[PDB]
Amino acid sequence: RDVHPTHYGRVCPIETPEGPNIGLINSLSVYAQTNEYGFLETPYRKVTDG
Amino acid sequence: DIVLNPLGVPSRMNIGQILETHLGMAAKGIGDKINAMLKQQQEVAKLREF
Amino acid sequence: GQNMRVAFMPWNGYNFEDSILVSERVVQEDRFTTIHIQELACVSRDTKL
Amino acid sequence: ARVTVQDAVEKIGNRFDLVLVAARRARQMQVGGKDPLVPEENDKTTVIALREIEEGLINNQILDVRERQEQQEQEAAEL
Amino acid sequence: EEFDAIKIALASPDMIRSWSFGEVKKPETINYRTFKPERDGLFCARIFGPVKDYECLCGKYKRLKHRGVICEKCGVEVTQTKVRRERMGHIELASPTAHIWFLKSSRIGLLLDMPLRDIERVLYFESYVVIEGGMTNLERQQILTEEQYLDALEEFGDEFDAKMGAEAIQALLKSMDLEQECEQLREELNETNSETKRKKLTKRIKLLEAFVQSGNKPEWMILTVLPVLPPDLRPLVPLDGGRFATSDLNDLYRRVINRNNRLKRLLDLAAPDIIVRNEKRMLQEAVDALLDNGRRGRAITGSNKRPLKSLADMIKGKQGRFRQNLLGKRVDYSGRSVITVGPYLRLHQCGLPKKMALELFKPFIYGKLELRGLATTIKAAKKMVEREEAVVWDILDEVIREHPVLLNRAPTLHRLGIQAFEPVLIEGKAIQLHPLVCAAYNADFDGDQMAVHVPLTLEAQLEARALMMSTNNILSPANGEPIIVPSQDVVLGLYYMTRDCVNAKGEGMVLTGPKEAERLYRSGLASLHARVKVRITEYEKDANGELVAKTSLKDTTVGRAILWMIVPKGLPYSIVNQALGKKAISKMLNTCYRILGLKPTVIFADQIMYTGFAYAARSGASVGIDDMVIPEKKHEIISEAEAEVAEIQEQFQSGLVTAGERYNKVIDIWAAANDRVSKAMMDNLQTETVINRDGQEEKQVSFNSIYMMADSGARGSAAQIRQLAGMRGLMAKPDGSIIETPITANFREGLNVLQYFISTHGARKGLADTALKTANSGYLTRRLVDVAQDLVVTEDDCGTHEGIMMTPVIEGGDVKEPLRDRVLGRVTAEDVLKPGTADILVPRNTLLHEQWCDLLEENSVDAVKVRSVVSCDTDFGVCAHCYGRDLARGHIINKGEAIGVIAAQSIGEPGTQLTMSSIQVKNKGSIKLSNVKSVVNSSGKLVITSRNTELKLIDEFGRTKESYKVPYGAVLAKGDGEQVAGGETVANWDPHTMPVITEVSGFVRFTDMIDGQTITRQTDELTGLSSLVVLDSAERTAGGKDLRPALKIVDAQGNDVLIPGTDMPAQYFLPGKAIVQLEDGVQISSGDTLARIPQGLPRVADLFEARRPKEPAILAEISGIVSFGKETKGKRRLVITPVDGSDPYEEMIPKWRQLNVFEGERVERGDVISDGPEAPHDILRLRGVHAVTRYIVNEVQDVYRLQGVKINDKHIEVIVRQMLRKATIVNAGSSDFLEGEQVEYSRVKIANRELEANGKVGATYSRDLLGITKASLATESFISAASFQETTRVLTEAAVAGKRDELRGLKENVIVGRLIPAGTGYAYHQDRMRRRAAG
Ligand SMILES: [Mg+2]
Ligand SMILES: [Zn+2]
Ligand SMILES: [Zn+2]
The missing domain is CATH 1.10.132.30 (RNA polymerase Rpb1 funnel domain)
Incomplete structure (x- = not known):
């Protein structure tokens, strides 16, 4: 039920109920998608030489 | 319109709620002059500046 | 929801523990009115009688 | 009286016997038709008992006496 | 109707035949087209009876011309209804098969001297078994395989008895007579009473003579005739959709009834014996499946691919009939709403909405309509209740006056879970409360659902008035401070009302009356916070409870003058002369009912929130x-x-x-x-x-x-x-x-x-x-009410002798709990004195209320004997003089009020928020330390050479202020019985070593330790000087691991320098990590260091669980010299020696933990030997009972006190007094040898046998401490033990016992529905028991 720092950007850490299912129900972030294999993904801007 | 308890602010640490209330004071704070200038019915080019 | 003009003070114990207070103006302008649609039905059968 | 019964618990000394002394006395006022001893001031059957216990006119010992004076005369009527 | 008791036995086959009404044969249930039952079915009218009345099935007999005949064409009975729940059925079985509760719970394998996996070897017909050896080469209970069974036929054929099947166990039980078995067992028990032979064999002896006294027969362990549940409790009803629905039992019979028919059809055709034995499998699968589905293997399932509900799951767990339909229920005359706050009320009045309260009093409205006669009949009143005449609102107004009502909120935390108000009707749709009682429920105003209840009877209409009106409890039973404390906003504006500043205009003016002191505020001449002298008029009871007056001026503000009109004439001015925060108001509330009664405080609390909110709104408080x-x-x-x-x-x-x-x-x-x-x-x-x-x-x-x-x-x-x-x-x-x-x-x-x-x-x-x-804690509260359910205050004064002496808890830090505040509400255990000697204040028993806590406070008392609940010795209960002040009312408790619930409640409630060297004294003081053995150092100061010593910082009088523990091997710089300075470190030593310091004085030699034989010599690398360094037990060589390396402190001759004052020699028998610094011949003195030995809610869960820890710091069996055992064949041993008694004993000790005593040291009995936490049972076996509980109530109270939750200690005391409800007996003479029994019954019988009947023919006892999982289970009652856990093992062990129940417990008096023998009913139940004396 704890939030790992790989949840960052893929699964929101606030939107959850406070009943007995508190650690289970989770929603995905704004810009997340589903990759061709099934893993999660999140966009990032690529810095090139600053 | 609505009166509520002012002793819920520090022990929920919701200083966001006090932060919200001031903007709505300004939100009609632009709107009332527009209503002051529409029924009194001055001009177009006075309004487009404002 | 709606916008409303809001104050902040204790009143004569009507905001004692998190209990909020209205006027009649928010009911006269009906800004907090909802509709509901329920459903009713009836069935007709044949019994052994 | 109305909201308290605290001065009456001195008149017995027990909390739970204060239940049963009014439980007997109010029961005869319901089905028997007995008359009260304290004036009503527009109250129901249960609360008029505790005023008489506050004035001490109803006690656990004395309640049987008014039955015993009745029981010694009720069998006297038939035989 | 009325019965005295309840009773269990085993059911006879003939007793099953008696109750039944017909033998079911065919498995039909309803004729498929016309919904009527069929003959001999599961709903057969010839057996069970009718559905209608005086109406027959074939329609032959009508118009009551045929009254007293069964209708022979259809067989239906004639008589009156409500019989469909009362009659039972029976069925005959072809081959008698085994029950399931006596197989894999086993109570036959115990009884037939065989393990359960070998008696399972008969019930699947894989193995034969032998009944009796006629020819004596074979014996009883011989397992033979199938081919080996045929070798038995090839040997003799007829001269032995060996079958295979469930018939054989029936024949096996008929064979043995229990008398020559049990009399042989007692003949066998005495010869060898070794421990595994001891307890195992007597468990048979516990059951074997029990069958003789119960009078039953052990052949009734196997059923031949199975009962049938009544047809109502397995209903088959047409549904609202026009289909049917059955319970799960009414097809499982169709498994048993069908597989019965396949057997009786088979045996008259005589199939071979691989088909026939397979048939007797499935009945034993099916008579299982009637009793239990999910027990013996893969369960039997229906069409939903889910397990079928058995007969066992009717009783098992929280889904069963116990916790869902018997203890809690539903009730009528009920309702619920959202809650809201209305502060216009008084304290005892609560809201009640209109169109809720019209249904909630519908029987009351009809009766008062038929009494005035405005309603002609009952149906007319239901016709008029929709007309809504104005008198209906008047008759309801007539009937709701002074008729109390209960308020509830689930879940009930403690005793204040439900109260009783008087209603006041408003026109809305919500329940209004009073704002001060929200903190009592822990209900906040954000959408709860509080429920109502209406008491019907005349007694409960008094019982709301007599016990649970909101005025009659302001004392919460946890602790004697009021729960009616001003909560959240009332403390704001009232803090505004008393305030000091120079800002207000008109300051320093003088106001004559407090009345006109308000007048300057209200027209607006100066603010309420400005200092002006006011004439005040107070009254005190300084005479014999009589008022006198005094009048003067006091320098205060004008705000504090206005608050004076509310305090009702009975307390001085100093309570409101201050800043007046929440620390002040609550103790102001405590002052009133202390002095003034009860009637002022309910008015005095009521006048708070009237003047509390009304000035806060005039104030206004914001936030920006x-x-x-x-x-x-x-x-x-x-x-x-x-x-x-x-x-x-x-x-x-x-x-x-x-x-x-x-x-x-x-x-x-x-x-x-x-x-x-x-x-x-x-x-x-x-x-x-x-x-x-x-x-x-x-x-x-x-x-x-x-x-x-x-x-x-x-x-x-x-x-x-x-x-x-x-x-x-x-x-x-x-x-x-x-x-x-x-x-x-x-x-x-x-x-x-x-x-x-x-x-x-x-x-x-x-x-x-x-x-x-929250989930864990509610499980814990359920496990606390169970073990303490029996306690009622039966007698007033048992008159037993001394008990616990009371001491404060302020060790290690400041003053934490004063001695006055624990002893308050208790009584004196004895005639106790004052420090002015022989000045006794008590004739052995007085209530110690606050008036007498003054006399304690002016002296210097810090030690008082308190009559606890442990020394109370009345039969089946505790007495009032051992329990003292009921904290919830405020006096001695009346005789008949419940105890164990009110202690189990107030432990349960706060657990929600539960889970979240150099020794410097503070001030100076006299140094008084006792039970010491110390010697003067070579430096000259105090050296600690005894483990029992600990410091105590004492005032000028004798009271304790500080205290700290000091271990062995420590160094001081000060002395005892002297005066020391403040801000001072009086104790200074190295704690990281456990030094091996020496009271002895003389030379030290290299003897009894040889390098290369006992130890090695690894010299100090830097300076060059070292000693014969004592290495560990296995780290040294095994050639001299047998020699305990004994450095010998020697003298000018070189002989054994003894202990000072004794003849016993002084040589350390050291294990490893003993590095001596000084060389050979170096002389030691008094105090020279030879070597150095360097270095949550689950807590409240385990301590009433009595769970043993993982490393128990075990103690000494006896005093005297102590030594070491064998050469650690797995573990070392301890040959300790008593001073004069039997010195044989030794046992396993894990030597790898650092020991405290050594092989030549002296100890007193009952001292810490190993290290770690310590198990409570070993404290019970070694110490008494007082040192056990004084450890526990010190332990669990500190876990709460760290979180700042005050619990009186009397609550936690009675749950250890119901933790000891059993005892194991030591000797004999009238009773069993060693087995467990109830320690209340022992003090009865030794007051019978070891009283004037004989000198001694009874026995002496031990005491046992048992955790709460089973301390409720081994009880003289059984339904309360059947109520909550392990519901199979509670019935069956009592089922063959032939137990009975005297209905002593209160829980069993709930499920019968009579009065509880407590509260009010204790006045009633003393009448019915004495009619049973002559009756
Ligand atoms: Mg609430
Ligand atoms: Zn018929
Ligand atoms: Zn007692």
Whole structure:
């Protein structure tokens, strides 16, 4: 039920109920998608030489 | 319109709620002059500046 | 929801523990009115009688 | 009286016997038709008992006496 | 109707035939087309009876011409209804098969001297078994395989008895007579009573003569004729959709009835014996499946692919008939609503809405309609209730006056879960309350559902008035301070009403009456906070409870004059002459009913929130952004915090500092920075307010109402005002890492994204914990009411002797719990004195209320005998003089009020918030330390050579102030019986070593230790000088691991230097880690160090669980000299020696833990030997009972006291007195040899046998302590033990016992429905018992 720092950007850490299912129900972030294999993904801007 | 308890602010640490209330004071704070200038019915080019 | 003009003070114990207070103006302008649609039905059968 | 019964618990000394002394006395006022001893001031059957216990006119010992004076005369009527 | 008791036995086959009404044969249930039952079915009318009345099935007999005949064409009975729940059925079985509760719970394998897997070898017909050896080569209970069974036929054929099947167990039980078995067992028990032979064999002897006294027969363990459940409790009803639905039992019979028919059809055709034995499998699968589905293997399932509900799951667990339909229920005359607050009421009045209260009193409205005669009939009144005449609102107004009503909120936390008000009708749709009782429920006004109840009977209509009106309990039974404390907003405006400042105009004027003191405020001439002398008029009871007057002026403000009109003439002015925060108001409330009665306080509390809210609204209190100010001495200090964390960022990369010590240094500077930023913000909210008045500038208290919120502590505290200003301290990832960079900025200047993300862990770790704790705790509260259910105050004064002496708890720190506040509400155990000698204040028993706590307070008493609940010795209960003051009312408890629930409640409730050297004395004092053995050092000062010594800091009188424990081998610089200075470290030694210091004086020699034989010589590398270094037990060589290396302290001759004052020699028999520094021949003196030996809610869960720890610090069986055993064949042993008795004993000790005593040291019995935590049972076996409970009530009270929750100790005392409800007996003479029995019954029988009947023919006893999982289970009653846990093993062990029940417990008097023998009913139940004396 704890939030790992790989949840960052893929699964929101606030939107959850406070009943007995508190650690289970989770929603995905704004810009997340589903990759061709099934893993999660999140966009990032690529810095090139600053 | 609505009166509520002012002793819920520090022990929920919701200083966001006090932060919200001031903007709505300004939100009609632009709107009332527009209503002051529409029924009194001055001009177009006075309004487009404002 | 709606916008409303809001104050902040204790009143004569009507905001004692998190209990909020209205006027009649928010009911006269009906800004907090909802509709509901329920459903009713009836069935007709044949019994052994 | 109305909201308290605290001065009456001195008149017995027990909390739970204060239940049963009014439980007997109010029961005869319901089905028997007995008359009260304290004036009503527009109250129901249960609360008029505790005023008489506050004035001490109803006690656990004395309640049987008014039955015993009745029981010694009720069998006297038939035989 | 009325019955005395309840009784179990085993059911005879003939007793099953008696109750039944017909033999079911065919498995039909309803004829498919016309919904009528069929003959001999599961609903057969010839067996069970009718559905209608006087109406037959074939329609032959009508019009009551045929009354007294069964209708022979259809067989239906004629007589009156309500019989479909009363009759039972029976069925005959072809082959008698085995029950399932006596197989794999086994009570036959115990009884037939065989393991259960070998008696299973018969019930699947894989193995034969032998009944009796006619020819004596074979014996009883011989397992033979199938081919070996045929070799038995080839040997003899007829002269032996061997079958295979469930018939054989029937024949096996018929064979043995129990008398020549049990009499042989007692003949066998006495010859060898070794331990595994002891307890195992008597468990048979517990059951074997029990069958003789129960009179039953053990052949009835196997059923031949199975009963049938009545047809109502397995109903088959047409549904609202026109289909049917059956319970699960009414097809499982169609498994048994069908597989019965396949057997009786088979045996008259005589199939071979691989088909026939397979048939007797499935009945034993099916007579299983009637009794239990999910027990013996894969369960039998229906079409839904889910397990079928058995007969066992009717009784098992919280889904069963116990906790869902018997103890709790549904009830009529009920309702619910959302709750809301209406503060216009008085204290005892509560709201009740209109169109709820019309249905809730519908029988009352009909009766008063038929009494006035406005309603002609009953149906007309139901016709008129929709007309809504105005008199209906009057008759309802007539009937609701002074008719009380109950308020509820699920879940019930403690005794204040339900109260009783008088209703006041409003026109809405919501329940209004009074605002002061929200804290009693722990209900907040955010959408609960409070429920109502209406008492019907005349007694309960008094019982609401007599016990549970809101006025008649203001004392919460946890602790004798009122729960009617001003909660959350009332403390705000009342704090505004008393305030000191020079700002208000007209200050210093004089007001004559407090009446006209209000007059200056109300027209608006000066503010309520301005200092003007007022004439005050108070009254005291300084005469014999008689009022006198006094009148004077006092220098105060004009606000405090207005509050004087509310205190009702019975308390001085000093209670409201102050700042008046929540620390003051609650103890003002305690002062009133102390002095004035009860009738003032309910009025005095009522006049608070009237004048409380009305001035707060005239005040007005707000909150703004610039109101909560961000200081200036934070970010420059953060600019210093960036000027030190960038420093050791560079020193980390150099390679000088480590990682973990660097982790201690940033948390040294950032976590203390929560306190460095604390002094900037408290300085910028206390005295930034400057309102000058007839001068240059001035200082006063704050005008922000944020400090004035915080110092009240309603919401907000010293830490809660900090996170509105700066960083909120520290954060922790719940996986286990605490971050080096927590928050720096604040709630007004924003949070960064990563700082927001890490602060989520502070929520979701904690937010999931509240629910889990709540779940655990409600399980715990259920497991506390169970073990303590029996206690009622039966007698007043048992008159037993002395018990516990009381001591304060203030060791280790300041004054924590004063002695007066524990002994308050208790009584004197004896005639106790004053320090003026022989000045007794008590004839052996007085109530110690606060008036007598004055006499204790003026002297210097710190030690008093208290009559506990442990020494109370009345039969089946406790007495009033051993329990003392009922804290919930405020006097001695009346005889008949319940105890064990009111202690099990008030332990359960606060558990929700439960889960979240160099010795310096403070002041001077006399030094009084006793039970010591110390010697003067070569330095000259006090050396601690005994483990029992600990310090005590004493005042000028004799009372204790501080105390600290000191271990062995320690050094002081001071002395005892003397005077010391303040701010002083009186004790100084190295604690990291456990030194091997020496009371002995003389030379030390290298004897009894040889290098290369006993130990090795690893000399000191630097200076060169070392000693024969004593190495560990296995780390040395095994050739001299047998020799205990004994350094011998020798003399000028070189002989055995003994202990000073005794003849016993002094040589240390050392295990390893004993590095001696001094060489051979170096003389030691008094105190020379030879060597050095260097170095939550689950807590309250286990301590009433009585769970044993993992390393028990075990104690000594007996005193005297102690030594070491064998050469650790797995573990070492301890040959200890008593002083004169039997010295044989030795046992396994894990020597790898550091021992305390050595092979030549002396000890007194009952002292700590190994190290670690300690098990309670060994404290029971070694100490008495008083030292056990005084350890427990010290232990569990500290877990609450750390969280600041005050519980009186009398609650936790009675649950250990119901923890000891059993005993194991030592000797014999009248009873069993050793087995367990109830320790209440022992003191009966030794007051019978070892009283004047004989000298001694009874027995002596031990005491046992048993955890709460089974201490309820072994009880003289059984239904209460059947009520909650392990529901199979409670019935069956009692089922063959032939037990009975006297209905002693109160829980069993709930499920019968009579009065409880407590509360009111204790006046009733003493009448019915004495009619049973002559009756
Ligand atoms: Mg609530
Ligand atoms: Zn018929
Ligand atoms: Zn007692």
